Amino acid sequence: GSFVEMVDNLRGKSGQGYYVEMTVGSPPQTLNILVDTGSSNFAVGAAPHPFLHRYYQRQLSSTYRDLRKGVYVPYTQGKWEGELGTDLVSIPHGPNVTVRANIAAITESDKFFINGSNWEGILGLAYAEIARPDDSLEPFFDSLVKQTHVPNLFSLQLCGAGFPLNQSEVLASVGGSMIIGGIDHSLYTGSLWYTPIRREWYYEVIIVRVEINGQDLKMDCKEYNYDKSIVDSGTTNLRLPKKVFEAAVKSIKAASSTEKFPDGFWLGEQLVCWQAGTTPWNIFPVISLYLMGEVTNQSFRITILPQQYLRPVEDVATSQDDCYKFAISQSSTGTVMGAVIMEGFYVVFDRARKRIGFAVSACHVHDEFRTAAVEGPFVTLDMEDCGYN
Template sequence: MRTTTTTSTLALLATSAHAALPHLSIAKRDSNLQTSPLARGLIRRDGGTVGTNVFDILAYSTGGAYYANVTVGTPPQDQVVILDTGSSDLYFDASTASTCETTGPYSCRGGTFNPQNSKTYSIADPAPAFNTSFGDGSTAVGPFGQDVVGLGDVLISNVQFGVAQEVNSTTGYAIGLMGVGYSENEAVQQHPYPNMPEVLRDTGVINSRLYSVFLNDVAEYSGSILFGGIDTTKYTGELATLNILADINTGAVDQFVQTVTGLSASISGKTIPLFSGGSPNEQAYTQTDTALPVLLDTGSSAWSVPTSYYEKYIAPNFKFVDSQGSCSCSHQNDDTTLTLEFGAKINITVPIREFVVPIYNATTNQPYPYPGGGEACAFMIVPAQSTGQGFQTLGDAILRSMYVVFDLDNGQLSLAQAKINSTDAPNIVTVSAGPSGIAKAVSTSYSAAPSNTNSIAPEVMNATGSFTVSTAQSTIGSATGTAAVPADAQVSGGASGTGSSSGGSSSSTGSKGAAAGLVVPRSDWSGLWVAGISVAMAVLGAGIVL
């Protein structure tokens, strides 16, 4: 049985056992870095929410990525980790990893963890207990450790995580990762452990395994994840709940899979229906169904569609995309949108600027030129072969236009059109435990769903000791905007913010995260640019290694 110890320092939580919702957020920074309230990290707390940041880095990967600031150890060591709904592990790169001792294109840019410098660190399971591999051929191996992890202004002791003592990065910089998928998909050989959604629930900080994600517009540095609640100012229109599809092989709910049941394009004011009439349930897995099962994955940059769909629906309407999957960034200004229907219930409209994304040189942080003039952009809807899992990956190119509530306990996703660049003061509502939690929290413009009758992956019991929760002296990662981005990732002379080229991880011991380590064909950029620089675009990428 799990036990929770709460220290006396939780004065801010004293009014309610579930008052503090860790809210990782960031707003676009204004030009005056010294006088802006956000420059000082003064993020107002609504209903006990905890503010820190989720930020966007173009230079770390083709298409960018969404990262969070966390700390580990005593005294705390700062870490930058990818926020990934397509995988489940929390892990950091070890300072002793040979990759992290270099300064080249495959070095560790997100900070490293030195266990010897933490007086509260212990080994939970010796190396190679943490052993994960990725779709791009990258690997990370080491022990599972246990220490104090900081998130927002919450510090939690006895949190388990991987320590990557061996890091083999094949496509770019190595970065740590915070996977927030079902813990059933962790890269463990024997003993699953509570990951971050479960840790926060176990400590009583939130009521259930639930969080909301808002990535915001591609031109912003902004994004947020709110554990335990919903910010009603971050979406517009109806919030619709859909049941997560069961796994095609096991019949259990353990990944965030839903269906795209219809697709249309609007080009220069003309609406072009592409496909419709697909099934909103497991029937979509059949080859005769027109729906596309998709994994909602913040750790992936692109929307991967079957090659047949790409050739029939996408390529004819986006003829400016070349054979390398690139185009001139001038097309970001085209009068073009896509509208996706999810689960035969909710429509999401995506402007072209969200899936035509600038490409940066990860070493120089400079944009690439496009042959014929202007700057080069990647087209982030890509053809892909079968994953063997029954679904493709729907990444940040689409997710930026969506507000998504991931409800792990009830096996459901709630979707709405994102209200990008909203300047409204946050209106954060706490979601209570149970099947009616969202309905109680969102009283208007809400469409519920019947209970998911499939088997839902259960919460993992904490076998390594009790958690202790306290508050940090200052908010972790309180800087915002460009100040939150590591100096070596600052882009020069280009647009900010896009999605991630990484995808969920796949363990060599059986983890299924993000299409089970599927190797996706990459664009060959060699010889395309004047400088002759080769850039690999990994649309699933897998986890942290970019």
């Protein structure tokens, strides 16, 4: 472990998002910022909102620069409108550097800020191609690398607790690590396996095979990447294209058929509860996602447990029961490897070598019988044909 200053610098959870502490302006204004690999805009609340306890005050920053331009970002459900500008930015539990970066000062928003989340802004870590208004708005990570000696790489260890946490427990507990400029070897076990970044827009990857308890889903691999497959810390669930979702749910139901669950559970709408400590993890199957490797005709696999895809939630009666929602859902915008997936792994965003590394997380939730896995190599032909165009 050679990045001690950055270890344990995250807080939060899969459902409301993981955040890092940052400061903006002169003198520094402290804000909690959502770490999002599924967007490319750095934005902060800059006007009072019922869910914000603090916000960026441009008139109190002597280093604030007005870009005199409007900006709008529509997300999956939420959205915001704001005003573009620049300021000095630092990450207290990050590299010991200050950079001048673009900041969208949020003036209006709908279903963006989450009550009790503890975050007041969003750090879009993806590439300029998906930045709004357009690709001329340099994302924060690009500015950081260009202005400093920080290597063009970041890595994320998201730590799911495996049980519910209220707002107060979230504040008090460590939610993970964001290592800026390096790979901290204390955050994972086993080997790091790398998948290519197909195109620099979202963090786009190629899934070449899917298994449920070792049983091949047997779909044309193009289906798994229709119309794209992305790694997104800003999305909670594992989201699958409609056809893949229907086939995966049918297979997960058949594997867990010793117990019957209502349709609302499988639709990700209603919770299922079990008496304290009796969740039957063993009846639920493991899920393997095979990803294209860096060597020609070579693949590797990442394997998750129900401890990853069953999201802990507090009971409607707040009882001693262990309650969960099914964290797999349909998508009409391709595969999304969200926070519940990422929680099983140490993920290295190697922008310099246009590749994503995965290793078993030192903080993944498991039992005495099974663990999450990263294994290879596998001989896999015609992998570039799995890519949708």
